[PDB]
Structure 1
Amino acid sequence: WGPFLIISPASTLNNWHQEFTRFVPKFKVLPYWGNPHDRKVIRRFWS
């Protein structure tokens, strides 16, 4: 139930969420990339 963070090379910003659909699907996982208002706006959801 803790907060955690992953940093990765950009071409791996896909398997890093797909793994959390099969190994254990229970996690609250948030991707973060895109145009400024694609990405930054997700910080207004978790606050």
Structure 2
Amino acid sequence: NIWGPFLIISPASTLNNWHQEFTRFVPKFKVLPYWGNPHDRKVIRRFWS
């Protein structure tokens, strides 16, 4: 389950806190949340698709 994808459901206000705590926690793992508008959905679609 390490190499597999993991979807974490967190609030929009705690997304930055989980991103900072995840970056300072495990820097070897990439943190790529999902937020924004249709443009950010196109960027996340180009990167994650």
Q: Which TM-score band (shorter chain)?
A: 0.7 to 0.9
Structure 1 alignment gaps of length 5 or more: none
TM score, norm. by length of structure 1: 0.74
8 A contact 1:20–1:26 mirrored in 2? no
Structure 2 alignment gaps of length 5 or more: none
8 A contact 1:17–1:29 mirrored in 2? yes
Question: Which runs of structure 1 show a deviation greater than 3 angstroms over 4 or more consecutive aligned residues?
Answer: none
CA RMSD of aligned residues (A): 1.4
Query: How far apart, CA to CA, are the structure 2 residues paired with 1:41 and 1:24?
Result: 24
TM score, norm. by length of structure 2: 0.72
